[PDB]
């Protein structure tokens, strides 16, 4: 049983790490939290601290209000019955306004007006969380890659429930707030638009969701294959190539003819994932607006 | 040819542009390619060498520029087995001691890696105030057995990644009372022994030593690690 | 040609089959017995696709479809133009994939690195074998397998899933999806985190790993660690594919109905039997 660095053998533990200061407003930084011996089997045991300033608090406030808006609507649709509430929890659904309400905000509360209010609260939670992921990196002297890669995911989200329904002309076109209901909507959307499998931006989004899973299995296993030389210390391998990085690249060069660097596999990785929703966003923006039937269009063009 | 037509064709032109960016970014080490005698290769492919980039290294350690002129900065005791290219190069001496094949090290910085605050990243636990084994079989004091099934020493310390609170090395006390370091990723900790399938006991002393007792350099780490992993190929004559 | 640091690694040793006979490189590509084999198996399979292409009568990659035998051949064999080519081609691909993971293992031995990689690939091989072997056999016929066509294999996914109402309601399908999304979420953050430290703001020195930990602690309240995120990436990606393999192996053999019917087990549950109110009452 030649040990494989999947789970830790000996967890060790000392003083909590308070982290870099740099320019972080320590006033807005919470204290350090408990240590999870259970999470130490897989990674770091230390829990916390968190930052929580103006932006994070605005984010969690609206984010909660989106959650309590959808929930109270479930609580209403269940006759306020704490047993009907758990029965149908995955069947409840806050639906946007019916189409002939268009993009009007005068749609009544119980018939679309509540969807507009959670969607406001959720719009604010995301974007001020997005602003948070940016400032967190500024405060520490880091590049902004996290916020940029996050704006990739926001993009398909702004498309589903905002940009595309606007261009379609009614809120009805957005995605309902419900477990099963949003899946029904996803099925319906492909049928309405002539089989999405033929939307060439969808078939790209898939290649990247798959390829994102290919690449992290590739990368996650490689770094574990060369952790026996400190390979996970990627910064100092970037800084100062060690046999770990040389051995990682050569496995791949011998295996498939070409290889990355310890920096550059991170560019492959950021882009492979980011492209998932960049293409996914484009193919959805284009459905119903410019292309009605993707299968028929697949015959006209290519 | 419509907006969606335009779109998709544009995305594939972007995409080809992005793969071109990424491959060249991934040429900032090891390039240009060399002949097997170590002079510039005739042929390099279609992707060019990337424009240098620099990293300013913290704690005054300087700056890195890549691609820069590559040199192994170490004697390589190996030699072509073959006239034309593509064949093994066989080790001319002891590959383990000489650092080749699965035993390779890199001339890394003979300095220790520093954390954010400028202290050594790695420290033996009995130099790391407050650090202790927190779960799983605490291995200090355990005899260390090699792949010959004979004992090589006894564990005296655990060397920890402070910022990240992980066992990295077992310090191991050999027959002469001196010690070597053993990678944690290369040992099996058991209730009554530590087993090292990579080396036989007789080899434990060929582990490269550290020139100081409470720190280790990246140069040292690299020598210590590649040698232990070199035993999988090279101490297998003794694995039964 | 070689990477400027590659020479000291091109040593003899580490082969699993054939001793030193195949211990060499072709350009950057290692050879070894299983690259011999990979070449053989993948060479044959490509010929028989080219054959299967001259029978169909088209040399367009986007129309070429090697179809599995008819449902009515059960698990037998078929003529080359009625499934036999799909059957051999499937055997060359399985040979090519297994060979490829084994050649990788020789490479792990020569370079003295972990065997994590070919083990992770082997999950992709299980997934393939699940759709082309384990599932069709359990159902009793090769014809239940997906064809080798660029678009026909998407029609196969299409046709198959809509046999079960919405394949969305398959509870293992949702666990596989959740893992696939979370893998992509994690690969984005993790590449972005390293790049944000390797390439800090202008007028700054290259950040450190502590700077990485603090970013994520500030952001979400926990840093899994640089070793943990790579274990997480591996666990995440293999779990997606293992639940894919689950979600399919149980579909057709031990579950037959509209996959949404499965979720009557929660609704008809006794402790809220017949209540007036909600969606289902
Ligand atoms: C519809 C669109 C709607 C979608 C909405 C959201 C879009 C998604 C955003 C995508 C970003 C993901 C990647 C993140 C990343 O790598 O960040 C690096 C980097 C990190 O930023 P930083 O740390 O703050 O700044 C430091 C430096 O920039 C330097 O930092 P660094 O050195 O660490 O990083 C270098 C980076 C920095 O480069 C940049 O400045 C980034 C470029 C902008 C990002 C947008 C890319 C997506 C474009 C859409 C595709 C269109 C298809 C239609 O280099 C690149 O990104 C180079 C890209 C290669 C270009 C591809 C070549 C195509 C040419 C085609 C010709 C060939 C064909 C021949 C036949 O990002 C940027 O520099 C800014 C990116 C801008 C993001 C959006 C801002 C407002 C718009
Ligand atoms: C996984 C569940 C379903 C499935 C459902 C879908 C759906 C749904 C979609 C695809 C899509 C694709 N699928 Mg499929 N597909 C499956 C099984 C496979 C197998 C296989 C051996 O099992 C292969 C090789 C492919 C191959 C492919 C490509 C045509 C395409 C992009 C994949 C990608 O980037 O993946 C990640 C891999 C990488 C990034 C690495 C590079 C992969 C290369 C491109 C694969 C080349 C195959 C080549 C054309 C055929 C072999 C050449 C031979 C010598 C003849 N599918 C099973 C049956 N697949 C998408 C598409 O565009 O379809 C037209 C799409 O929308
Ligand atoms: C029957 C159903 C249809 C179909 C209909 C659709 C539709 C409709 C859509 C997709 C889309 C997707 N499809 Mg399809 N699809 C089908 C068949 C498939 C198959 C397959 C094997 O058959 C596969 C693998 C896929 C694959 C995929 C992905 C490539 C893509 C989703 C990317 C993603 O991560 O979204 C998930 C990620 C996001 C949605 C981004 C979220 C970002 C936001 C900002 C995060 C908010 C969090 C929130 C505030 C909560 C915080 C809570 C607190 C943390 C507690 N499709 C068939 C043909 N598919 C999408 C797409 O882009 O198509 C082009 C899409 O919308
Ligand atoms: C109409 C379509 C149905 C549906 C029906 C199905 C069916 C049917 C199946 C899936 C399967 C999948 N679906 Mg579903 N699914 C739907 C909606 C979705 C949506 C969505 C957004 O709505 C998503 C995200 C998904 C997600 C997924 C994943 C769970 C899974 C695909 C990955 C996988 O299995 O990889 C597994 C990976 C492989 C098979 C790849 C193996 C590759 C081999 C080992 C190597 C190939 C090398 C190649 C030949 C090399 C070329 C040369 C080199 C490139 C040089 N489905 C709708 C409702 N879905 C599939 C699944 O679970 O499969 C197990 C499946 O069969
Ligand atoms: C490459 C694109 C992929 C991706 C990327 C991506 N996502 C990202 C990022 C990136 C790069 C971030 O930086 C950003 C982030 O912050 O990451 C940590 C994020 C993120 N991606 C998220 C989700 C997400 N990403 C997804 C997808 C993906 N994101 C793509 C696959 C998906 C789906 C559907 O596949 C989801 C759900 C979030 C984790 C986060 C964005 C967070 C945000 O803006 O949140 C606003 C909300 C709040 C601040 C609070 C909400 C509160 C809850 C509603 C309350 C419920 C809890 C209950 C009341 C608790 C009770 C008491 C407890 C003690 C139990
Ligand atoms: C389990 C996590 C992910 C995973 C992991 C993974 N895959 C891997 C690896 C790893 C860790 C490798 O080491 C290995 C590799 O070398 O990657 C570069 C591989 C790899 N994954 C690949 C592809 C791939 N992986 C996929 C999936 C996944 N791979 C998972 C998401 C997918 C899809 C559809 O999701 C594809 C297409 C290859 C690039 C590579 C394996 C290359 C290989 O095996 O080459 C040997 C075989 C040949 C050179 C040719 C075989 C030719 C056949 C005989 C004829 C064609 C038969 C085939 C069935 C036809 C298909 C037709 C299509 C229309 C369907
Ligand atoms: C830190 O480490 C890291 C690196 O290194 C520093 C790495 O590079 C990698 C590896 C990752 C990359 C290089 C980034 C790009 C990779 C992807 C996005 C994954 C997708 C990859 C492909 C689609 C490549 C496909 C090519 C294949 C499958 C091989 C091509 C095959 C041939 C043309 C010949 C194959 C050889 C044969 C037939 C056998 C013997 C040879 C003869 C000719 C005989 C990782 C993960 C990493 O973590
Ligand atoms: C314990 O119970 C209580 C009551 C305390 C609870 O809190 C329980 C709560 C719940 C059970 C709620 C759980 C929620 C769900 C099951 C719903 C799941 C939701 C989803 C899966 C969302 C799917 C996709 C949603 C999308 C795509 C949203 C897009 C948002 C828009 C981009 C935002 C745009 C904003 C607009 C249009 C607002 C317009 C108005 C302005 C002023 C701008
Ligand atoms: C068990 C339940 C099954 C579902 C799966 C649950 C896991 C949730 C993952 C969230 C991804 C966000 C965190 C992962 C991204 C970490 C980014 C990173 O690169 O971390 C490096 C390290 O933290 C500093 O060095
Ligand atoms: C809410 C107060 C947070 C401080 C508590 C610190 C928790 C660390 C306790 C160590 C316990 C280890 N254990 C038993 C959980 O594995
Ligand atoms: C940044 C990494 C680049 C990897 C891109 C992989 C391309 C996969 C090709 C899938 C083809 C999609 N489509 C719709 C044209 O069939
Ligand atoms: C892009 C998806 C599939 C295309 C095949 C993969 C590209 C070939 C990779 C091997 C290149 C090695 N080589 C010959 C350049 O040295
Ligand atoms: C989808 C993965 C394929 C992307 C191709 C990326 C680069 C391939 C060619 C690299 C050339 C390496 N070489 C042989 C010049 O050393
Ligand atoms: C995935 C785990 C979730 C991590 C979130 C942790 C938040 C940190 C808050 C710790 C609180 C400290 N203290 C003592 C003020 O309670
Ligand atoms: Fe990494």
């Amino acid at each position: 049983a030649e040990y494989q660095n999947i789970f830790t053998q000996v967890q060790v533990r000392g003083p909590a790490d308070l982290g870099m200061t740099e320019d972080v407003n320590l006033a807005n930084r919470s204290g350090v939290g408990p240590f999870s011996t259970l999470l130490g089997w897989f990674g770091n045991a230390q829990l916390g601290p968190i930052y929580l300033g103006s932006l994070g608090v605005l984010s969690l406030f609206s984010g909660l209000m989106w959650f309590f808006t959808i929930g109270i609507w479930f609580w209403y649709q269940a006759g306020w019955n704490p047993a009907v509430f758990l029965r149908d929890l995955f069947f409840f659904s806050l639906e946007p306004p019916a189409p002939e309400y268009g993009l009007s905000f005068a749609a009544p509360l119980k018939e679309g007006g509540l969807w507009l209010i959670a969607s406001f609260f959720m719009f604010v939670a995301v974007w001020s969380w997005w602003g948070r992921t940016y400032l967190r990196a500024q405060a520490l002297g880091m590049g902004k890659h996290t916020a940029w890669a996050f704006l990739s995911a926001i993009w398909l989200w702004m498309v589903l429930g905002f940009i595309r329904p606007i261009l379609m002309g009614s809120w009805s076109e957005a995605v309902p707030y419900g477990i099963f209901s949003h899946l029904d909507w996803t099925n319906n959307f492909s049928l309405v638009h002539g089989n999405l499998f033929y939307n060439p931006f969808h078939g790209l989004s898939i290649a990247f969701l798959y390829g994102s899973a290919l690449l992290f299995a590739m990368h996650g296993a490689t770094i574990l294959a060369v952790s026996r030389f400190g390979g996970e210390r990627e910064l100092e391998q970037i800084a100062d190539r060690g046999t770990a990085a040389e051995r990682a690249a050569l496995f791949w060069r011998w295996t498939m003819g070409f290889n990355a660097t310890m920096e550059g596999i991170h560019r492959w990785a950021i882009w492979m994932a980011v492209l998932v929703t960049l293409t996914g966003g484009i193919g959805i923006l284009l459905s119903g607006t410019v292309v009605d039937n993707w299968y028929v269009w697949g015959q006209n063009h290519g | 040819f419509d907006l969606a037509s335009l779109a998709i064709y544009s995305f594939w032109i972007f995409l080809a542009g992005l793969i071109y960016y990424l491959q060249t970014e991934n040429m900032r080490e090891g390039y240009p390619l060399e002949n097997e005698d170590g002079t510039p290769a005739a042929n390099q492919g279609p992707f060019p060498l990337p424009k240098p980039k620099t990293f300013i290294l913290p704690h005054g350690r300087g700056t890195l520029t890549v691609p820069g002129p590559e040199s192994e900065d170490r004697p390589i005791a190996l030699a072509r087995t073959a006239v034309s290219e593509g064949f093994p190069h066989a080790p001319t001496g002891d590959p383990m001691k000489d650092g080749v094949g699965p035993a390779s090290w890199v001339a890394r910085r003979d300095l220790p890696e520093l954390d954010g605050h400028g202290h050594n990243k790695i420290k033996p636990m009995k130099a790391a105030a407050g650090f202790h084994v927190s779960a799983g079989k605490n291995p200090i004091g355990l005899p260390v057995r090699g792949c010959d099934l004979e004992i090589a020493g006894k564990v005296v310390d655990i060397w920890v990644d402070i910022p990240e609170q992980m066992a990295r090395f077992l310090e191991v006390e050999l027959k002469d009372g001196s010690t070597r370091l053993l990678p944690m990723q290369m040992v099996k900790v058991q209730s009554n022994r530590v087993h090292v399938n990579a080396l036989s006991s007789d080899l434990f002393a060929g582990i490269p030593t550290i020139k100081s007792p409470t720190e280790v350099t990246l140069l040292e780490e690299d020598k210590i690690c590649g040698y232990v992993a070199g035993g999988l190929m090279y101490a297998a004559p003794k694995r039964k | 040609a070689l990477l400027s640091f590659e020479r000291k690694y091109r040593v003899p040793g580490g082969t699993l089959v054939g001793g030193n006979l195949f211990d060499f490189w072709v350009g950057p590509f290692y050879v070894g017995f299983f690259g011999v084999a990979t070449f053989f198996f993948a060479a044959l399979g490509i010929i028989l696709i080219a054959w299967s292409a001259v029978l169909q009568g088209t040399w367009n990659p986007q129309l070429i479809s090697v179809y599995p035998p008819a449902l009515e051949y059960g698990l037998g064999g078929a003529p080359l133009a009625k499934g036999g080519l799909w059957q051999i081609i499937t055997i060359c691909a399985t040979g090519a994939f297994v060979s490829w993971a084994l050649r990788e293992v020789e490479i792990c031995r020569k370079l003295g690195i972990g065997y994590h990689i070919p083990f992770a690939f082997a999950f992709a091989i299980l997934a393939y074998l699940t759709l082309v072997l384990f599932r069709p056999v359990m159902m009793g016929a090769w014809g239940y397998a997906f064809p080798y066509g660029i678009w026909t294999h998407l029609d196969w996914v299409s046709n198959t899933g809509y046999t079960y109402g919405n394949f969305h309601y398959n509870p293992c399908h949702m666990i596989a999806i959740t893992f696939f999304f979370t893998n992509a979420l994690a690969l984005a953050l993790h590449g972005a985190l390293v790049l944000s430290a390797a390439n800090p703001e202008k007028g700054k020195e290259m950040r450190t790993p502590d700077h990485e930990d603090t970013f994520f602690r500030d952001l979400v309240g926990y840093s899994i660690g640089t070793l943990g995120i790579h274990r997480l990436g591996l666990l995440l990606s293999l779990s997606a594919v293992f639940f894919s393999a689950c979600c399919m192996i149980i579909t057709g053999t031990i579950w037959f109905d509209q996959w949404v019917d499965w979720w009557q087990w929660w609704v008809k549950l006794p402790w809220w039997a017949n209540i007036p109110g909600g969606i289902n009452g």
Side-chain angles (χ1 to χ4, degrees), chain A residues 107-122:
Chain A
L109 208 73
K110 260 134 28 163
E111 306 171 337
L114 207 71
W115 183 100
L116 287 171
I117 289 165
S119 289
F120 164 86
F121 285 141
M122 159 181 220

PDB file of all heavy atoms in Angstrom, chain A residues 107-122:
ATOM      1  N   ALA A 107     -46.827  44.266 -12.489  1.00  0.00           N
ATOM      2  CA  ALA A 107     -47.384  42.941 -12.304  1.00  0.00           C
ATOM      3  C   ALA A 107     -47.587  42.697 -10.810  1.00  0.00           C
ATOM      4  O   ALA A 107     -46.679  42.984 -10.013  1.00  0.00           O
ATOM      5  CB  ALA A 107     -46.457  41.892 -12.911  1.00  0.00           C
ATOM      6  N   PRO A 108     -48.752  42.194 -10.389  1.00  0.00           N
ATOM      7  CA  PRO A 108     -49.035  42.078  -8.951  1.00  0.00           C
ATOM      8  C   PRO A 108     -48.064  41.140  -8.248  1.00  0.00           C
ATOM      9  O   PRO A 108     -47.376  40.322  -8.863  1.00  0.00           O
ATOM     10  CB  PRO A 108     -50.470  41.524  -8.902  1.00  0.00           C
ATOM     11  CG  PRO A 108     -50.662  40.838 -10.204  1.00  0.00           C
ATOM     12  CD  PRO A 108     -49.825  41.608 -11.214  1.00  0.00           C
ATOM     13  N   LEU A 109     -48.053  41.249  -6.923  1.00  0.00           N
ATOM     14  CA  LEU A 109     -47.089  40.518  -6.110  1.00  0.00           C
ATOM     15  C   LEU A 109     -47.228  39.006  -6.299  1.00  0.00           C
ATOM     16  O   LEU A 109     -46.290  38.327  -6.731  1.00  0.00           O
ATOM     17  CB  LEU A 109     -47.283  40.908  -4.647  1.00  0.00           C
ATOM     18  CG  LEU A 109     -46.056  40.806  -3.746  1.00  0.00           C
ATOM     19  CD1 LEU A 109     -45.083  41.924  -4.070  1.00  0.00           C
ATOM     20  CD2 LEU A 109     -46.449  40.813  -2.276  1.00  0.00           C
ATOM     21  N   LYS A 110     -48.406  38.461  -5.994  1.00  0.00           N
ATOM     22  CA  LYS A 110     -48.627  37.021  -6.086  1.00  0.00           C
ATOM     23  C   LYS A 110     -48.543  36.483  -7.509  1.00  0.00           C
ATOM     24  O   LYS A 110     -48.532  35.261  -7.681  1.00  0.00           O
ATOM     25  CB  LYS A 110     -49.991  36.655  -5.489  1.00  0.00           C
ATOM     26  CG  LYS A 110     -49.959  36.104  -4.058  1.00  0.00           C
ATOM     27  CD  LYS A 110     -51.025  36.746  -3.174  1.00  0.00           C
ATOM     28  CE  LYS A 110     -52.241  37.205  -3.980  1.00  0.00           C
ATOM     29  NZ  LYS A 110     -53.430  37.449  -3.121  1.00  0.00           N
ATOM     30  N   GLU A 111     -48.488  37.339  -8.525  1.00  0.00           N
ATOM     31  CA  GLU A 111     -48.516  36.883  -9.911  1.00  0.00           C
ATOM     32  C   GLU A 111     -47.356  37.464 -10.713  1.00  0.00           C
ATOM     33  O   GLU A 111     -47.484  37.764 -11.901  1.00  0.00           O
ATOM     34  CB  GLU A 111     -49.862  37.205 -10.558  1.00  0.00           C
ATOM     35  CG  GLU A 111     -51.073  36.661  -9.779  1.00  0.00           C
ATOM     36  CD  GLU A 111     -52.404  37.172 -10.329  1.00  0.00           C
ATOM     37  OE1 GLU A 111     -52.419  38.231 -10.992  1.00  0.00           O
ATOM     38  OE2 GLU A 111     -53.441  36.530 -10.086  1.00  0.00           O
ATOM     39  N   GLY A 112     -46.194  37.602 -10.086  1.00  0.00           N
ATOM     40  CA  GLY A 112     -45.006  37.980 -10.821  1.00  0.00           C
ATOM     41  C   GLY A 112     -44.203  39.025 -10.089  1.00  0.00           C
ATOM     42  O   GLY A 112     -42.971  39.033 -10.148  1.00  0.00           O
ATOM     43  N   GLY A 113     -44.913  39.905  -9.386  1.00  0.00           N
ATOM     44  CA  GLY A 113     -44.301  40.982  -8.635  1.00  0.00           C
ATOM     45  C   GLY A 113     -43.372  40.520  -7.541  1.00  0.00           C
ATOM     46  O   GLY A 113     -42.475  41.274  -7.136  1.00  0.00           O
ATOM     47  N   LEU A 114     -43.561  39.300  -7.043  1.00  0.00           N
ATOM     48  CA  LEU A 114     -42.646  38.799  -6.026  1.00  0.00           C
ATOM     49  C   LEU A 114     -41.346  38.292  -6.644  1.00  0.00           C
ATOM     50  O   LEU A 114     -40.262  38.520  -6.094  1.00  0.00           O
ATOM     51  CB  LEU A 114     -43.335  37.723  -5.202  1.00  0.00           C
ATOM     52  CG  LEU A 114     -42.775  37.623  -3.789  1.00  0.00           C
ATOM     53  CD1 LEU A 114     -43.155  38.816  -2.912  1.00  0.00           C
ATOM     54  CD2 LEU A 114     -43.309  36.360  -3.178  1.00  0.00           C
ATOM     55  N   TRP A 115     -41.440  37.628  -7.799  1.00  0.00           N
ATOM     56  CA  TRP A 115     -40.256  37.263  -8.574  1.00  0.00           C
ATOM     57  C   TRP A 115     -39.389  38.481  -8.875  1.00  0.00           C
ATOM     58  O   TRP A 115     -38.156  38.390  -8.895  1.00  0.00           O
ATOM     59  CB  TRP A 115     -40.689  36.592  -9.879  1.00  0.00           C
ATOM     60  CG  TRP A 115     -39.562  36.101 -10.746  1.00  0.00           C
ATOM     61  CD1 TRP A 115     -39.102  34.812 -10.857  1.00  0.00           C
ATOM     62  CD2 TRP A 115     -38.752  36.888 -11.628  1.00  0.00           C
ATOM     63  NE1 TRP A 115     -38.072  34.751 -11.761  1.00  0.00           N
ATOM     64  CE2 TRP A 115     -37.827  36.011 -12.237  1.00  0.00           C
ATOM     65  CE3 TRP A 115     -38.720  38.247 -11.974  1.00  0.00           C
ATOM     66  CZ2 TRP A 115     -36.880  36.451 -13.156  1.00  0.00           C
ATOM     67  CZ3 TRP A 115     -37.779  38.677 -12.899  1.00  0.00           C
ATOM     68  CH2 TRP A 115     -36.884  37.780 -13.483  1.00  0.00           C
ATOM     69  N   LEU A 116     -40.016  39.628  -9.146  1.00  0.00           N
ATOM     70  CA  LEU A 116     -39.225  40.813  -9.458  1.00  0.00           C
ATOM     71  C   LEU A 116     -38.475  41.315  -8.236  1.00  0.00           C
ATOM     72  O   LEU A 116     -37.416  41.925  -8.381  1.00  0.00           O
ATOM     73  CB  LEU A 116     -40.116  41.916 -10.032  1.00  0.00           C
ATOM     74  CG  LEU A 116     -40.602  41.694 -11.467  1.00  0.00           C
ATOM     75  CD1 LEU A 116     -41.659  42.743 -11.831  1.00  0.00           C
ATOM     76  CD2 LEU A 116     -39.447  41.727 -12.457  1.00  0.00           C
ATOM     77  N   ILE A 117     -38.989  41.033  -7.031  1.00  0.00           N
ATOM     78  CA  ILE A 117     -38.408  41.581  -5.812  1.00  0.00           C
ATOM     79  C   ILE A 117     -37.248  40.719  -5.323  1.00  0.00           C
ATOM     80  O   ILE A 117     -36.219  41.240  -4.873  1.00  0.00           O
ATOM     81  CB  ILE A 117     -39.494  41.757  -4.730  1.00  0.00           C
ATOM     82  CG1 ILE A 117     -40.427  42.905  -5.108  1.00  0.00           C
ATOM     83  CG2 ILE A 117     -38.878  42.079  -3.378  1.00  0.00           C
ATOM     84  CD1 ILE A 117     -41.713  42.955  -4.338  1.00  0.00           C
ATOM     85  N   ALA A 118     -37.388  39.394  -5.397  1.00  0.00           N
ATOM     86  CA  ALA A 118     -36.253  38.517  -5.119  1.00  0.00           C
ATOM     87  C   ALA A 118     -35.148  38.719  -6.152  1.00  0.00           C
ATOM     88  O   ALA A 118     -33.964  38.737  -5.806  1.00  0.00           O
ATOM     89  CB  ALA A 118     -36.712  37.054  -5.101  1.00  0.00           C
ATOM     90  N   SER A 119     -35.528  38.879  -7.424  1.00  0.00           N
ATOM     91  CA  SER A 119     -34.559  39.082  -8.497  1.00  0.00           C
ATOM     92  C   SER A 119     -33.775  40.374  -8.310  1.00  0.00           C
ATOM     93  O   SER A 119     -32.593  40.443  -8.659  1.00  0.00           O
ATOM     94  CB  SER A 119     -35.277  39.103  -9.842  1.00  0.00           C
ATOM     95  OG  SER A 119     -35.735  37.813 -10.191  1.00  0.00           O
ATOM     96  N   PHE A 120     -34.424  41.418  -7.797  1.00  0.00           N
ATOM     97  CA  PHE A 120     -33.697  42.615  -7.377  1.00  0.00           C
ATOM     98  C   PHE A 120     -32.707  42.288  -6.274  1.00  0.00           C
ATOM     99  O   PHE A 120     -31.528  42.655  -6.353  1.00  0.00           O
ATOM    100  CB  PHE A 120     -34.682  43.676  -6.898  1.00  0.00           C
ATOM    101  CG  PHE A 120     -34.054  44.789  -6.101  1.00  0.00           C
ATOM    102  CD1 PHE A 120     -33.497  45.889  -6.729  1.00  0.00           C
ATOM    103  CD2 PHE A 120     -34.046  44.747  -4.704  1.00  0.00           C
ATOM    104  CE1 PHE A 120     -32.930  46.940  -5.981  1.00  0.00           C
ATOM    105  CE2 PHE A 120     -33.465  45.777  -3.956  1.00  0.00           C
ATOM    106  CZ  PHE A 120     -32.914  46.880  -4.600  1.00  0.00           C
ATOM    107  N   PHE A 121     -33.184  41.610  -5.221  1.00  0.00           N
ATOM    108  CA  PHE A 121     -32.329  41.269  -4.086  1.00  0.00           C
ATOM    109  C   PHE A 121     -31.170  40.369  -4.504  1.00  0.00           C
ATOM    110  O   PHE A 121     -30.047  40.513  -4.003  1.00  0.00           O
ATOM    111  CB  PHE A 121     -33.156  40.587  -2.993  1.00  0.00           C
ATOM    112  CG  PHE A 121     -34.049  41.536  -2.202  1.00  0.00           C
ATOM    113  CD1 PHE A 121     -35.330  41.155  -1.823  1.00  0.00           C
ATOM    114  CD2 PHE A 121     -33.573  42.766  -1.770  1.00  0.00           C
ATOM    115  CE1 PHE A 121     -36.129  42.004  -1.077  1.00  0.00           C
ATOM    116  CE2 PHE A 121     -34.370  43.620  -1.031  1.00  0.00           C
ATOM    117  CZ  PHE A 121     -35.643  43.242  -0.684  1.00  0.00           C
ATOM    118  N   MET A 122     -31.425  39.434  -5.420  1.00  0.00           N
ATOM    119  CA  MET A 122     -30.363  38.557  -5.894  1.00  0.00           C
ATOM    120  C   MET A 122     -29.394  39.297  -6.813  1.00  0.00           C
ATOM    121  O   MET A 122     -28.185  39.056  -6.757  1.00  0.00           O
ATOM    122  CB  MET A 122     -30.964  37.331  -6.599  1.00  0.00           C
ATOM    123  CG  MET A 122     -30.006  36.630  -7.532  1.00  0.00           C
ATOM    124  SD  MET A 122     -30.667  35.213  -8.410  1.00  0.00           S
ATOM    125  CE  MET A 122     -29.222  34.179  -8.292  1.00  0.00           C
TER     126      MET A 122
END
